Amino acid sequence: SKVKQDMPPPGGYGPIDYKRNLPRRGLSGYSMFAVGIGTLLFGYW
Amino acid sequence: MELVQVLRRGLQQVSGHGGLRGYLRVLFRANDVRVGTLVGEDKYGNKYY
Amino acid sequence: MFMINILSLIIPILLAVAFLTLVERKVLGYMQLRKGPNVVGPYGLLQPIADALKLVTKEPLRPGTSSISMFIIAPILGLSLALTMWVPLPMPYPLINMNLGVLFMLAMSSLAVYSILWSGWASNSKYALIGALRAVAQTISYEVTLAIILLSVLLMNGSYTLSTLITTQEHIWMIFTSWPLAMMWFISTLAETNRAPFDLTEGESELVSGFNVEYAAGPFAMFFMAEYANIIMMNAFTAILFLGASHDPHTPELYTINFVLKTLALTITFLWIRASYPRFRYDQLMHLLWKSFLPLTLALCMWHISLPIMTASIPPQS
Amino acid sequence: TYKFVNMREPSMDMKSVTDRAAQTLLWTELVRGLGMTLSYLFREPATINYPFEKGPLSPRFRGEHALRRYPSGEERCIACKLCEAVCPAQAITIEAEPRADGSRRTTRYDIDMTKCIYCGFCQEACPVDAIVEGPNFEFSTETHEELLYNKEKLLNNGDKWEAEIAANIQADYLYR
Amino acid sequence: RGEYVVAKLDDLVNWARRSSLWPMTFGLACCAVEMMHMAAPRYDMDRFGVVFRASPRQSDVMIVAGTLTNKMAPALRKVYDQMPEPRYVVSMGSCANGGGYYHYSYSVVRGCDRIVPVDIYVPGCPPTAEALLYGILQLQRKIKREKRLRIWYRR
Amino acid sequence: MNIMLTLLTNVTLASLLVLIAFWLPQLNAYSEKTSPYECGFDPMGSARLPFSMKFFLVAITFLLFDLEIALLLPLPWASQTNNLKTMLTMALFLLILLAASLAYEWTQKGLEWAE
Ligand SMILES: CCCCCCCCCCCCCCCCCC(=O)OC[C@H](COP(=O)([O-])OCC[N+](C)(C)C)OC(=O)CCCCCCCCCCCCCCCCC
Ligand code: SF4
Numbered sequence: 011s012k013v014k015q016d017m018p019p020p021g022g023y024g025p026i027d028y029k030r031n032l033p034r035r036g037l038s039g040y041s042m043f044a045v046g047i048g049t050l051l052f053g054y055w
Numbered sequence: 056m057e058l059v060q061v062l063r064r065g066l067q068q069v070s071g072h073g074g075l076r077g078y079l080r081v082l083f084r085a086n087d088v089r090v091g092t093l094v095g096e097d098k099y100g101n102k103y104y
Numbered sequence: 105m106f107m108i109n110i111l112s113l114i115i116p117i118l119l120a121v122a123f124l125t126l127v128e129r130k131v132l133g134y135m136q137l138r139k140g141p142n143v144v145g146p147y148g149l150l151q152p153i154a155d156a157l158k159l160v161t162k163e164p165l166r167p168g169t170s171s172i173s174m175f176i177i178a179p180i181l182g183l184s185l186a187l188t189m190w191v192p193l194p195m196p197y198p199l200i201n202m203n204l205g206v207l208f209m210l211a212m213s214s215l216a217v218y219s220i221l222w223s224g225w226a227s228n229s230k231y232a233l234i235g236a237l238r239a240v241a242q243t244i245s246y247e248v249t250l251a252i253i254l255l256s257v258l259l260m261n262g263s264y265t266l267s268t269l270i271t272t273q274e275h276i277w278m279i280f281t282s283w284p285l286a287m288m289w290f291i292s293t294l295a296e297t298n299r300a301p302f303d304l305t306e307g308e309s310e311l312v313s314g315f316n317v318e319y320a321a322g323p324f325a326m327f328f329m330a331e332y333a334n335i336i337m338m339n340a341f342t343a344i345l346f347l348g349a350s351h352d353p354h355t356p357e358l359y360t361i362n363f364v365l366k367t368l369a370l371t372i373t374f375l376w377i378r379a380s381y382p383r384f385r386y387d388q389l390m391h392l393l394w395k396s397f398l399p400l401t402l403a404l405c406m407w408h409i410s411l412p413i414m415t416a417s418i419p420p421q422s
Numbered sequence: 423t424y425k426f427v428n429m430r431e432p433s434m435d436m437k438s439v440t441d442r443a444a445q446t447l448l449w450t451e452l453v454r455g456l457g458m459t460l461s462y463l464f465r466e467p468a469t470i471n472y473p474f475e476k477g478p479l480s481p482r483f484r485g486e487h488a489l490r491r492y493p494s495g496e497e498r499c500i501a502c503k504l505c506e507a508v509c510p511a512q513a514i515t516i517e518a519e520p521r522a523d524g525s526r527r528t529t530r531y532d533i534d535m536t537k538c539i540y541c542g543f544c545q546e547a548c549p550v551d552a553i554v555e556g557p558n559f560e561f562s563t564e565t566h567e568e569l570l571y572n573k574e575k576l577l578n579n580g581d582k583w584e585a586e587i588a589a590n591i592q593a594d595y596l597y598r
Numbered sequence: 599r600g601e602y603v604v605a606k607l608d609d610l611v612n613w614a615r616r617s618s619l620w621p622m623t624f625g626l627a628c629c630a631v632e633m634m635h636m637a638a639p640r641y642d643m644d645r646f647g648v649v650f651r652a653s654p655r656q657s658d659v660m661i662v663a664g665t666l667t668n669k670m671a672p673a674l675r676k677v678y679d680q681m682p683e684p685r686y687v688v689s690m691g692s693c694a695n696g697g698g699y700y701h702y703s704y705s706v707v708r709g710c711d712r713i714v715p716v717d718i719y720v721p722g723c724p725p726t727a728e729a730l731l732y733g734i735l736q737l738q739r740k741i742k743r744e745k746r747l748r749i750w751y752r753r
Numbered sequence: 754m755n756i757m758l759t760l761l762t763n764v765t766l767a768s769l770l771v772l773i774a775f776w777l778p779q780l781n782a783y784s785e786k787t788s789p790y791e792c793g794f795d796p797m798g799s800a801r802l803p804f805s806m807k808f809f810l811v812a813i814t815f816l817l818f819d820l821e822i823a824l825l826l827p828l829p830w831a832s833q834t835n836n837l838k839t840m841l842t843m844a845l846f847l848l849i850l851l852a853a854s855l856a857y858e859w860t861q862k863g864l865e866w867a868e
């Protein structure tokens with residue numbers, strides 16, 4: 011019988027992510043200010 | 056129709072405990088109403104799922 | 105019959121506070137990948153009862169260095185103010201219908217700062233007094249923005265009558281007309297109820313429990329009830345002020361359902377802030393109020409005085 | 423090799439400055455935090471329904487001690503005192519003498535479970551697999567005295583838990 | 599007779615007292631981290647009504663989680679005295695139980711029970727978070743079987 | 754008067770909750786139990802700890818701002834005048850003076866929590 015201990019798989023393990031991943035999401039500041047201004051305008055009207 | 060299946064699974068949890076009395080028994084004893092597979096029962100009365 | 109009205113206002117509010125404790129614990133638990141109360145009763149529905157019963161049978165240690173007169177007056181004042189804040193609220197029709205309802209709320213909530221100034225002073229211990237002074241300074245500083253924001257918003261209402269807010273917001277929410285003031289008002293309300301990153305007087309990791317260290321069991325419970333009643337009341341005021349619900353005079357239950365749902369949503373947001381942010385420093389929140397909120401509030405009060413005049417959109421005063 | 427953690431300068435043009443002004447005035451990263459908590463509220467909690475559900479363990483788990491026997495019912499302990507010698511906390515007290523049948527057996531075998539650090543050195547030192555740390559971890563007591571174990575107590579622990587103790591040993595002895 | 603009413607009232611008060619066991623975080627050493635692991639989502643001590651509490655004035659149980667040294671014992675007894683009643687003490691880990699690894703040291707008190715009365719002794723170094731949770735539920739069952747009002751009725 | 758009855762009920766029920774809260778529990782008190790809480794030790798009284806001019810200055814500045822707010826509260830009825838240009842001029846005047854008080858406190862140290 012051959013030896014049998016805890017070993018990596020023959021092809022190794024798949025890659026593991028470690029780098030930071032904070033996705034970019036949202037609109038630009040121009041869009042936010044335009045929306046905020048238009049909301050107030052319609053409210054006023 | 057997926058929320059329909061969620062409600063059906065809850066209702067089958069009621070039916071899967073042998074009625075409302077059995078459903079409330081396991082709700083108030085174990086604080087849980089999941090229906091599992093019975094793997095066995097020991098000589099002391101404990102049931103294992 | 106009016107006495108029955110008072111009772112059927114007060115008692116359900118206290119019950120709502122009791123179960124707000126459970127709701128807050130469960131929301132915090134589920135935001136933290138845990139469950140929260142789910143053993144004591146079905147889904148923890150008997151947990152507030154267990155807490156109330158355990159507290160009233162626990163020994164209420166009173167300090168040896170405590171002026172007991174104010175030591176017991178402070179919870180009475182706190183709870184009486186917290187309850188009386190609901191009497192002008194226009195769930196469709198108010199219990200008390202005043203011309204100056206929101207002025208009445210401003211005054212009553214400004215009297216609530218005494219319950220900390222008296223509890224910290226009465227508890228002695230020479231250190232809870234400093235926390236009480238910090239709490240009082242925070243409260244009075246945010247009273248400024250509360251008052252000015254309320255002033256600017258009500259320039260579309262035309263009066264201090266809260267029933268007129270329903271009429272003002274018939275076609276559109278007041279949020280669509282004053283959203284910046286809405287954000288500043290909401291954060292000011294957060295800060296006034298000593299909640300969220302503004303909970304400096306009861307910093308669990310800053311001063312353990314601050315002004316409430318010496319209070320235990322029963323008086324602690326009543327202080328807690330006062331704070332949570334103030335939380336729900338402030339969220340109800342916010343919903344009525346900014347998210348006015350449509351009113352049917354022949355079906356006021358629809359307005360009540362709308363208002364209750366919106367008040368619950370705002371309260372759940374209050375609990376949502378608690379689970380998401382770190383705590384402001386005392387000087388940091390004072391800087392926020394005095395150098396960020398106050399200039400914008402002054403500018404927006406100016407804007408909201410100018411706006412109805414220059415657009416011929418001044419509301420009626422009746 | 424190294425890397426810088428906070429060595430980025432913000433851009434100073436119209437669009438970036440307006441982005442930061444909108445982030446300042448509209449509380450956008452605070453909204454990201456609210457979104458993260460809201461996303462966690464709709465995730466299944468990691469809580470298990472104790473005691474109806476139990477935390478997962480391994481055959482190597484070191485819990486309550488037990489004294490074991492041979493299939494004949496004879497004790498395994500031959501009172502070599504290796505476990506007592508190696509015990510880091512000096513939690514093991516042993517007295518021995520020739521038994522009436524001549525066997526080398528203990529007359530005292532005490533473990534101060536409040537001295538014990540549950541390191542498992544005793545079951546490593548033992549040449550006959552007599553003393554073991556069993557799988558039991560729910561044996562809290564209402565008094566200090568019930569945690570000062572006797573030879574009778576440890577033998578009753580062995581007779582109580584041998585069925586699963588032996589299975590654990592069979593699972594892990596090839597690593598030992 | 600009137601002993602049925604007293605028994606029911608005792609049952610009610612003892613259900614309310616064990617359903618809101620608010621403990622005090624006395625984390626001295628390694629046993630402190632397994633106790634906040636029993637706090638963690640996997641075990642979620644809050645689901646039993648066992649909250650994360652604060653100053654001893656609102657605490658019902660003291661958990662001595664870690665080694666008590668001679669320098670530290672007066673503070674532990676002080677905060678134990680400051681707890682309102684009824685109050686309970688759980689000794690968690692070998693160090694708090696009977697000294698443990700440091701039993702023969704010049705600076706370690708051999709068991710917190712030399713300083714305070716202890717209700718539950720949780721063994722282990724450290725006890726697993728599940729072991730501490732078992733000790734907490736065992737304390738709850740201790741509270742369930744108290745007969746304070748029935749003792750008073752036969753006085 | 755309905756409001757008086759409401760206040761009486763609120764105060765009465767709060768005091769009744771005090772009475773149940775502060776008399777119903779079973780008590781057993783000794784000297785070291787009610788000792789002031791200081792995280793496991795005894796507190797020092799020292800001598801008039803609540804000091805520092807900044808706590809008093811924020812109170813005074815709040816007082817003056819609150820007085821100007823008292824001057825601003827009649828504004829909802831003030832917009833109902835035919836002489837709207839004078840009223841707008843005076844309301845904006847009061848608000849500029851509020852802003853000027855804030856700015857003067859700001860620039861001359863004022864609002865700062867110094868060393
Ligand atoms: C034609 C139109 C004319 C009128 C135009 C009106 C103006 C429109 C543009 C203005 C937009 C900004 C309005 C004010 C926003 C706040 C001001 C401020 O100081 O912000 C930055 C301030 C300070 O930010 P800071 O600390 O980054 O900046 C301080 C100053 N510097 C830059 C020098 C360092 O931040 C806050 O106020 C933070 C609040 C903390 C609590 C966060 C709570 C999050 C959850 C909110 C939920 C939604 C609330 C409302 C709910 C519903 C209520 C009904
Ligand atoms: S587990 Fe370690 S400390 Fe405990 S008896 Fe065995 S050798 Fe001694």
Ligand code: SF4
Nearest residue numbers: 499500502503505548
């Ligand atoms: S238990 Fe094992 S190591 Fe200890 S005395 Fe007996 S045979 Fe020796």
Ligand code: SF4
Nearest residue numbers: 627628691692693723
């Ligand atoms: S019993 Fe063990 S784990 Fe707990 S404090 Fe002592 S040495 Fe650390």
